[PDB]
CSV table of C-alpha atoms and ligand atoms in Angstrom, one decimal:
chain,number,residue,atom,x,y,z
A,1,UNK,CA,0.0,0.0,0.0
A,2,UNK,CA,1.1,3.6,-0.9
A,3,UNK,CA,0.0,6.9,0.7
A,4,UNK,CA,-3.6,7.1,2.1
A,5,UNK,CA,-5.5,10.3,1.1
A,6,UNK,CA,-8.2,12.5,2.7
A,7,UNK,CA,-11.3,13.3,0.6
A,8,UNK,CA,-13.8,16.1,1.3
A,9,UNK,CA,-16.7,14.8,-0.7
A,10,UNK,CA,-18.6,18.1,-0.8
A,11,UNK,CA,-22.1,19.0,-1.8
A,12,UNK,CA,-20.9,21.3,-4.5
A,13,UNK,CA,-17.1,20.8,-4.4
A,14,UNK,CA,-14.7,18.1,-3.4
A,15,UNK,CA,-11.1,18.2,-2.4
A,16,UNK,CA,-8.3,15.7,-1.8
A,17,UNK,CA,-5.2,16.0,0.2
A,18,UNK,CA,-2.2,13.8,1.0
A,19,UNK,CA,-0.1,14.1,4.1
A,20,UNK,CA,3.5,13.8,2.9
A,21,UNK,CA,6.9,14.7,4.4
A,22,UNK,CA,5.2,16.3,7.4
A,23,UNK,CA,2.7,18.4,5.4
A,24,UNK,CA,-0.6,18.2,3.6
A,25,UNK,CA,-0.4,18.6,-0.1
A,26,UNK,CA,-3.8,19.6,-1.5
A,27,UNK,CA,-3.7,17.9,-4.8
A,28,UNK,CA,-4.7,19.9,-7.8
A,29,UNK,CA,-6.8,18.0,-10.3
A,30,UNK,CA,-6.1,17.4,-14.0
A,31,UNK,CA,-7.2,21.0,-14.5
A,32,UNK,CA,-4.8,22.4,-12.0
A,33,UNK,CA,-7.6,23.1,-9.6
A,34,UNK,CA,-7.4,22.4,-6.0
A,35,UNK,CA,-11.1,21.7,-5.7
A,36,UNK,CA,-13.3,19.7,-8.1
A,37,UNK,CA,-17.0,20.4,-8.7
A,38,UNK,CA,-19.1,17.5,-7.3
A,39,UNK,CA,-20.7,17.2,-10.7
A,40,UNK,CA,-21.0,14.4,-13.1
A,41,UNK,CA,-22.4,14.9,-16.6
A,42,UNK,CA,-23.3,12.5,-19.2
A,43,UNK,CA,-23.1,13.4,-22.9
A,44,UNK,CA,-23.6,11.5,-26.1
A,45,UNK,CA,-20.0,10.2,-25.8
A,46,UNK,CA,-18.7,10.5,-22.3
A,47,UNK,CA,-19.0,10.7,-18.6
A,48,UNK,CA,-17.6,14.0,-17.4
A,49,UNK,CA,-16.6,14.5,-13.8
A,50,UNK,CA,-15.7,17.6,-12.0
A,51,UNK,CA,-14.7,20.7,-13.8
A,52,UNK,CA,-15.7,19.5,-17.3
A,53,UNK,CA,-19.1,18.5,-15.9
A,54,UNK,CA,-19.6,21.8,-14.1
A,55,UNK,CA,-18.4,23.8,-17.1
A,56,UNK,CA,-21.1,22.4,-19.4
A,57,UNK,CA,-24.1,22.4,-17.1
A,58,UNK,CA,-25.9,25.2,-19.0
A,59,UNK,CA,-25.3,23.2,-22.2
A,60,UNK,CA,-26.6,20.0,-20.7
A,61,UNK,CA,-28.8,20.7,-17.7
A,62,UNK,CA,-30.9,17.5,-17.6
A,63,UNK,CA,-27.9,15.2,-17.7
A,64,UNK,CA,-25.6,17.1,-15.5
A,65,UNK,CA,-26.1,15.7,-12.0
A,66,UNK,CA,-25.0,17.6,-8.9
A,67,UNK,CA,-26.2,17.7,-5.3
A,68,UNK,CA,-26.1,13.9,-5.1
A,69,UNK,CA,-25.0,14.5,-1.5
A,70,UNK,CA,-28.6,15.8,-0.9
A,71,UNK,CA,-29.9,12.4,-1.9
A,72,UNK,CA,-27.2,10.1,-0.6
A,73,UNK,CA,-28.6,7.7,2.0
A,74,UNK,CA,-32.2,8.9,1.5
A,75,UNK,CA,-35.4,7.2,0.3
A,76,UNK,CA,-37.6,8.5,-2.4
A,77,UNK,CA,-40.5,9.3,-0.1
A,78,UNK,CA,-38.3,11.5,2.0
A,79,UNK,CA,-39.7,15.0,2.3
A,80,UNK,CA,-36.2,16.4,1.7
A,81,UNK,CA,-35.8,14.4,-1.6
A,82,UNK,CA,-39.3,15.5,-2.6
A,83,UNK,CA,-38.6,19.2,-1.9
A,84,UNK,CA,-35.1,19.2,-3.5
A,85,UNK,CA,-36.3,17.4,-6.6
A,86,UNK,CA,-38.5,20.3,-7.3
A,87,UNK,CA,-35.4,22.5,-8.0
A,88,UNK,CA,-33.1,20.1,-9.9
A,89,UNK,CA,-33.2,20.0,-13.7
A,90,UNK,CA,-32.3,16.3,-13.7
A,91,UNK,CA,-34.8,13.6,-13.0
A,92,UNK,CA,-35.0,11.7,-9.8
A,93,UNK,CA,-37.0,8.5,-10.0
A,94,UNK,CA,-38.2,6.0,-7.4
A,95,UNK,CA,-36.5,2.6,-7.6
A,96,UNK,CA,-38.6,0.5,-5.3
A,97,UNK,CA,-38.3,3.1,-2.5
A,98,UNK,CA,-34.8,4.5,-3.2
A,99,UNK,CA,-34.1,7.6,-5.4
A,100,UNK,CA,-32.1,7.2,-8.6
A,101,UNK,CA,-30.9,10.1,-10.6
A,102,UNK,CA,-31.9,9.4,-14.1
A,103,UNK,CA,-30.0,10.7,-17.1
A,104,UNK,CA,-29.3,10.1,-20.8
A,105,UNK,CA,-25.8,8.8,-21.4
A,106,UNK,CA,-24.6,7.7,-24.9
A,107,UNK,CA,-28.3,8.1,-25.8
A,108,UNK,CA,-29.5,5.5,-23.2
A,109,UNK,CA,-31.6,6.1,-20.1
A,110,UNK,CA,-29.3,5.4,-17.2
A,111,UNK,CA,-30.0,5.8,-13.6
A,112,UNK,CA,-27.7,5.9,-10.6
A,113,UNK,CA,-28.2,5.7,-6.9
A,114,UNK,CA,-26.8,8.8,-5.3
A,115,UNK,CA,-23.7,6.8,-4.1
A,116,UNK,CA,-23.0,5.7,-7.6
A,117,UNK,CA,-22.8,9.4,-8.6
A,118,UNK,CA,-20.7,10.1,-5.6
A,119,UNK,CA,-18.4,7.1,-6.3
A,120,UNK,CA,-17.6,8.8,-9.7
A,121,UNK,CA,-16.6,12.0,-7.9
A,122,UNK,CA,-14.5,9.7,-5.5
A,123,UNK,CA,-13.0,7.9,-8.5
A,124,UNK,CA,-11.9,11.3,-9.8
A,125,UNK,CA,-10.4,12.3,-6.4
A,126,UNK,CA,-8.5,8.9,-6.4
A,127,UNK,CA,-7.2,9.5,-10.0
A,128,UNK,CA,-5.9,13.0,-9.4
A,129,UNK,CA,-4.2,11.7,-6.3
A,130,UNK,CA,-2.5,8.9,-8.2
A,131,UNK,CA,-1.5,11.3,-11.0
A,132,UNK,CA,0.0,13.6,-8.5
A,133,UNK,CA,1.7,10.9,-6.4
A,134,UNK,CA,2.8,8.7,-9.3
A,135,UNK,CA,1.7,5.8,-7.1
A,136,UNK,CA,-1.4,3.7,-6.5
A,137,UNK,CA,-4.0,5.2,-4.0
A,138,UNK,CA,-6.3,2.7,-2.3
A,139,UNK,CA,-6.8,4.0,1.2
A,140,UNK,CA,-8.9,7.1,1.9
A,141,UNK,CA,-10.5,9.0,4.7
A,142,UNK,CA,-13.9,10.3,3.4
A,143,UNK,CA,-15.7,13.1,5.1
A,144,UNK,CA,-19.5,13.6,5.7
A,145,UNK,CA,-21.7,16.3,7.4
A,146,UNK,CA,-22.1,15.8,11.1
A,147,UNK,CA,-25.8,15.5,10.7
A,148,UNK,CA,-25.5,12.5,8.4
A,149,UNK,CA,-27.4,9.5,9.8
A,150,UNK,CA,-26.4,5.8,9.5
A,151,UNK,CA,-28.0,5.5,6.1
A,152,UNK,CA,-26.2,8.5,4.8
A,153,UNK,CA,-22.8,7.3,6.1
A,154,UNK,CA,-23.2,3.8,4.8
A,155,UNK,CA,-24.2,5.2,1.4
A,156,UNK,CA,-21.0,7.3,1.5
A,157,UNK,CA,-18.9,4.3,2.4
A,158,UNK,CA,-20.7,2.5,-0.5
A,159,UNK,CA,-19.5,5.3,-2.8
A,160,UNK,CA,-16.0,4.8,-1.6
A,161,UNK,CA,-16.2,1.0,-2.1
A,162,UNK,CA,-17.5,1.5,-5.6
A,163,UNK,CA,-14.6,3.9,-6.3
A,164,UNK,CA,-12.2,1.1,-5.3
A,165,UNK,CA,-11.2,2.9,-2.2
A,166,UNK,CA,-10.6,1.3,1.1
A,167,UNK,CA,-12.5,3.9,3.2
A,168,UNK,CA,-10.4,3.8,6.3
A,169,UNK,CA,-13.0,5.9,8.2
A,170,UNK,CA,-16.0,8.1,7.6
A,171,UNK,CA,-15.2,11.3,9.5
A,172,UNK,CA,-17.4,14.3,10.1
A,173,UNK,CA,-16.5,17.4,8.1
A,174,UNK,CA,-16.5,19.8,11.1
A,175,UNK,CA,-14.2,17.2,12.9
A,176,UNK,CA,-12.0,17.1,9.8
A,177,UNK,CA,-11.6,20.9,9.9
A,178,UNK,CA,-10.8,20.8,13.6
A,179,UNK,CA,-8.1,18.1,12.9
A,180,UNK,CA,-6.7,20.3,10.1
A,181,UNK,CA,-6.1,23.0,12.7
A,182,UNK,CA,-4.7,20.4,15.2
A,183,UNK,CA,-7.4,21.2,17.7
A,184,UNK,CA,-7.5,17.6,18.7
A,185,UNK,CA,-3.8,17.6,19.4
A,186,UNK,CA,-4.6,19.7,22.4
A,187,UNK,CA,-4.3,18.2,25.9
A,188,UNK,CA,-6.4,19.3,28.9
A,189,UNK,CA,-9.8,20.7,29.2
A,190,UNK,CA,-12.7,20.5,26.8
A,191,UNK,CA,-12.6,23.0,23.9
A,192,UNK,CA,-15.7,24.1,22.1
A,193,UNK,CA,-15.1,24.6,18.5
A,194,UNK,CA,-17.6,26.3,16.3
A,195,UNK,CA,-17.2,25.4,12.7
A,196,UNK,CA,-18.8,28.0,10.5
A,197,UNK,CA,-19.1,26.1,7.2
A,198,UNK,CA,-20.5,28.3,4.5
A,199,UNK,CA,-20.0,26.2,1.4
A,200,UNK,CA,-21.3,26.7,-2.1
A,201,UNK,CA,-24.7,25.3,-1.4
A,202,UNK,CA,-25.1,24.6,2.3
A,203,UNK,CA,-24.5,26.4,5.5
A,204,UNK,CA,-23.5,24.3,8.5
A,205,UNK,CA,-22.7,25.6,11.9
A,206,UNK,CA,-21.4,22.8,14.1
A,207,UNK,CA,-20.3,23.0,17.6
A,208,UNK,CA,-18.0,20.2,18.6
A,209,UNK,CA,-16.4,19.7,22.0
A,210,UNK,CA,-13.0,18.2,21.9
A,211,UNK,CA,-11.3,16.6,24.8
A,212,UNK,CA,-8.2,14.4,24.8
A,213,UNK,CA,-8.3,14.0,21.0
A,214,UNK,CA,-12.0,12.9,21.2
A,215,UNK,CA,-14.8,14.7,19.4
A,216,UNK,CA,-18.4,15.2,20.4
A,217,UNK,CA,-20.9,16.8,18.2
A,218,UNK,CA,-22.9,19.1,20.5
A,219,UNK,CA,-25.1,20.8,18.1
A,220,UNK,CA,-25.7,21.4,14.4
A,221,UNK,CA,-27.6,24.3,12.9
A,222,UNK,CA,-27.6,26.0,9.5
A,223,UNK,CA,-29.5,26.3,6.4
A,224,UNK,CA,-29.3,23.4,3.9
A,225,UNK,CA,-30.2,25.8,1.1
A,226,UNK,CA,-27.9,28.7,1.9
A,227,UNK,CA,-24.4,29.0,0.5
A,228,UNK,CA,-22.0,31.1,-1.6
A,229,UNK,CA,-24.3,30.4,-4.6
A,230,UNK,CA,-26.9,32.5,-2.9
A,231,UNK,CA,-24.5,35.5,-2.9
A,232,UNK,CA,-23.5,34.9,-6.5
A,233,UNK,CA,-27.2,34.9,-7.2
A,234,UNK,CA,-27.7,38.4,-5.7
A,235,UNK,CA,-24.9,39.6,-7.9
A,236,UNK,CA,-26.4,37.8,-10.9
A,237,UNK,CA,-29.7,39.7,-10.5
A,238,UNK,CA,-27.8,42.9,-9.9
A,239,UNK,CA,-25.8,42.5,-13.1
A,240,UNK,CA,-28.9,41.3,-14.9
A,241,UNK,CA,-30.5,44.6,-13.9
A,242,UNK,CA,-27.3,46.5,-15.0
A,243,UNK,CA,-27.1,44.7,-18.3
A,244,UNK,CA,-30.8,45.6,-18.9
A,245,UNK,CA,-30.1,49.3,-18.2
A,246,UNK,CA,-27.0,49.5,-20.3
A,247,UNK,CA,-28.1,47.3,-23.1
A,248,UNK,CA,-31.9,47.2,-22.7
A,249,UNK,CA,-31.8,43.5,-22.9
A,250,UNK,CA,-33.1,41.1,-20.2
A,251,UNK,CA,-30.8,38.0,-20.2
A,252,UNK,CA,-32.9,36.2,-17.5
A,253,UNK,CA,-34.3,33.3,-19.6
A,254,UNK,CA,-31.0,32.7,-21.4
A,255,UNK,CA,-29.6,29.9,-19.4
A,256,UNK,CA,-26.1,30.0,-21.0
A,257,UNK,CA,-25.8,33.8,-20.5
A,258,UNK,CA,-27.1,33.5,-17.0
A,259,UNK,CA,-24.7,30.7,-16.3
A,260,UNK,CA,-21.7,32.6,-17.7
A,261,UNK,CA,-22.7,35.6,-15.7
A,262,UNK,CA,-23.1,33.3,-12.7
A,263,UNK,CA,-19.5,32.0,-13.3
A,264,UNK,CA,-18.2,35.6,-13.6
A,265,UNK,CA,-20.0,36.5,-10.4
A,266,UNK,CA,-18.6,33.4,-8.7
A,267,UNK,CA,-15.1,34.5,-9.7
A,268,UNK,CA,-15.9,38.1,-8.8
A,269,UNK,CA,-17.0,37.0,-5.3
A,270,UNK,CA,-13.7,35.2,-4.9
A,271,UNK,CA,-11.8,38.2,-6.2
A,272,UNK,CA,-13.7,40.5,-3.9
A,273,UNK,CA,-12.4,38.5,-0.9
A,274,UNK,CA,-8.9,39.8,-1.6
A,275,UNK,CA,-9.6,43.0,-3.4
A,276,UNK,CA,-12.0,45.9,-3.4
A,277,UNK,CA,-12.9,45.7,-7.0
A,278,UNK,CA,-13.5,42.8,-9.3
A,279,UNK,CA,-14.3,42.8,-12.9
A,280,UNK,CA,-17.0,41.0,-14.8
A,281,UNK,CA,-15.4,40.2,-18.1
A,282,UNK,CA,-17.7,38.4,-20.5
A,283,UNK,CA,-17.1,38.4,-24.2
A,284,UNK,CA,-20.4,38.0,-26.0
A,285,UNK,CA,-22.7,37.6,-22.9
A,286,UNK,CA,-25.9,37.9,-24.8
A,287,UNK,CA,-26.7,38.3,-28.5
A,288,UNK,CA,-22.9,38.9,-29.0
A,289,UNK,CA,-22.9,41.9,-26.6
A,290,UNK,CA,-19.9,41.9,-24.4
A,291,UNK,CA,-20.3,42.7,-20.7
A,292,UNK,CA,-17.3,44.3,-19.1
A,293,UNK,CA,-18.2,45.8,-15.9
A,294,UNK,CA,-17.0,45.6,-12.4
A,295,UNK,CA,-18.3,45.8,-8.9
A,296,UNK,CA,-17.0,47.0,-5.6
A,297,UNK,CA,-16.7,44.9,-2.6
A,298,UNK,CA,-19.1,47.4,-0.9
A,299,UNK,CA,-21.8,46.8,-3.6
A,300,UNK,CA,-21.4,43.0,-3.3
A,301,UNK,CA,-21.9,43.2,0.5
A,302,UNK,CA,-24.9,45.5,0.0
A,303,UNK,CA,-26.5,43.1,-2.4
A,304,UNK,CA,-26.1,40.4,0.2
A,305,UNK,CA,-26.5,42.3,3.4
A,306,UNK,CA,-29.5,40.5,4.7
A,307,UNK,CA,-28.1,37.0,3.8
A,308,UNK,CA,-24.8,37.8,5.5
A,309,UNK,CA,-26.6,39.0,8.6
A,310,UNK,CA,-28.8,36.0,8.4
A,311,UNK,CA,-25.8,33.6,8.9
A,312,UNK,CA,-25.8,34.7,12.5
A,313,UNK,CA,-29.2,33.1,13.2
A,314,UNK,CA,-27.9,29.5,13.0
A,315,UNK,CA,-24.8,30.5,15.0
A,316,UNK,CA,-27.2,31.5,17.7
A,317,UNK,CA,-29.4,28.4,17.3
A,318,UNK,CA,-26.3,26.1,17.4
A,319,UNK,CA,-25.2,28.0,20.5
A,320,UNK,CA,-28.7,27.6,22.1
A,321,UNK,CA,-28.8,23.9,21.3
A,322,UNK,CA,-25.3,23.3,22.6
A,323,UNK,CA,-26.3,25.3,25.7
A,324,UNK,CA,-23.2,27.4,25.1
A,325,UNK,CA,-22.8,31.2,25.3
A,326,UNK,CA,-20.9,32.7,22.4
A,327,UNK,CA,-18.1,33.4,24.9
A,328,UNK,CA,-17.7,29.7,25.5
A,329,UNK,CA,-16.4,29.1,21.9
A,330,UNK,CA,-12.6,28.6,22.0
A,331,UNK,CA,-12.1,28.3,18.2
A,332,UNK,CA,-14.1,29.5,15.3
A,333,UNK,CA,-13.0,27.5,12.3
A,334,UNK,CA,-14.0,28.9,8.9
A,335,UNK,CA,-14.8,26.3,6.3
A,336,UNK,CA,-15.9,27.0,2.8
A,337,UNK,CA,-14.8,29.7,0.4
A,338,UNK,CA,-17.6,32.1,1.3
A,339,UNK,CA,-16.0,32.3,4.7
A,340,UNK,CA,-13.2,34.3,3.0
A,341,UNK,CA,-15.7,37.2,2.5
A,342,UNK,CA,-14.4,40.1,4.6
A,343,UNK,CA,-18.0,41.1,5.5
A,344,UNK,CA,-18.9,37.7,6.8
A,345,UNK,CA,-15.6,37.4,8.8
A,346,UNK,CA,-16.4,40.9,10.2
A,347,UNK,CA,-20.0,40.0,11.1
A,348,UNK,CA,-18.8,36.8,12.7
A,349,UNK,CA,-15.9,38.5,14.6
A,350,UNK,CA,-18.4,41.2,15.6
A,351,UNK,CA,-20.8,38.7,16.9
A,352,UNK,CA,-17.9,37.0,18.7
A,353,UNK,CA,-16.8,40.4,20.0
A,354,UNK,CA,-13.5,40.6,18.1
A,355,UNK,CA,-12.3,37.0,18.4
A,356,UNK,CA,-10.0,36.1,15.6
A,357,UNK,CA,-11.0,33.3,13.3
A,358,UNK,CA,-9.1,30.2,12.4
A,359,UNK,CA,-8.7,30.8,8.7
A,360,UNK,CA,-5.0,30.3,7.8
A,361,UNK,CA,-5.8,27.0,6.0
A,362,UNK,CA,-7.7,27.7,2.8
A,363,UNK,CA,-11.3,27.3,4.1
A,364,UNK,CA,-12.1,25.3,1.0
A,365,UNK,CA,-9.3,22.8,1.7
A,366,UNK,CA,-9.5,22.6,5.5
A,367,UNK,CA,-11.8,19.6,5.5
A,368,UNK,CA,-9.7,17.5,3.0
A,369,UNK,CA,-6.6,18.7,4.8
A,370,UNK,CA,-7.9,17.3,8.0
A,371,UNK,CA,-9.1,14.2,6.3
A,372,UNK,CA,-5.6,13.7,4.8
A,373,UNK,CA,-4.1,14.1,8.2
A,374,UNK,CA,-6.4,11.5,9.6
A,375,UNK,CA,-5.8,9.2,6.7
A,376,UNK,CA,-2.0,9.3,7.3
A,377,UNK,CA,-2.7,8.4,11.0
A,378,UNK,CA,-5.1,5.6,10.1
A,379,UNK,CA,-2.7,4.0,7.6
A,380,UNK,CA,0.1,4.5,10.1
A,381,UNK,CA,2.2,7.3,8.5
A,382,UNK,CA,1.9,10.1,11.1
B,401,LIG,CL1,-19.4,22.3,-1.3
B,402,LIG,NA1,-16.9,25.1,-1.1
């Protein structure tokens, strides 16, 4: 056996790390990207996984599957499946009580249990790991949300097995982010760690208590339908309105245009985490009309002000449920790229009366980082 890897199998993005020579290397994919969209797409000729899949969603919406994590371990009758299905452009069918995403692939109707979709994303993670390492990768730590029940964890293990991984352990994502920061290396009294996990699509606030390297999930809160994508969306609508004033065209119903605007907004959001201005640079957005514009950080925050403020409600709920005062949190760990947003960091630090956030590990890589650490331990190489 070679190096074991850690895999953040995320709702919208996935990430793989390897602990080598005393450090975690986050492994860039075949596109040079350190995270990989949790997307699989099926075309007339191929199965696309990750960036290729995400990049052609607007071209192929009904055969581009994402959010499999929302289905994994669930039954068709589940109210969550029923509700979510209402907003996916791919089909979800009932196979004798279990949901299957149904797509066209090489012109055939094909259906996949959620864990089959997820195994594909895990197969990608395994491949980019082997490409990077130049060695076989069999052993993996795979992460899941702390709220996952037995069915959801077993279904995630099933995904690993399908991908040919020996899944050393299913570990909670908040726990992974804590391990990444070495918060379980600590010796002594219980520490309460709030993981503020604002991903692309989901917002999770978890409070863990860690004592003697042992994790307890105290409470979980959040919004399963709030993420960075919601902020992108407020910019989309804003820029849709701007495009309409400047060009007197409404791009709303053009899915490709909206998608490329969305992508530009997603990059702008990212840019705006380090700079006060970001451009939207879209050649031929709509009817060949270019859209070169730009937005300030201030305007971005303004567009999203209620949603940013709203992230504090689950923090308060998590704290209520954990029976902890905000002052009893020892560590706030930021997970998810949206947590790089200066305004969110300021709202969070403000709520926590100035407390500095654990944010030194790329919030998007923190879970895989921790998973890679744990993998190296579970395989006996740390
Ligand atoms: Cl994600
Ligand atoms: Na993310």
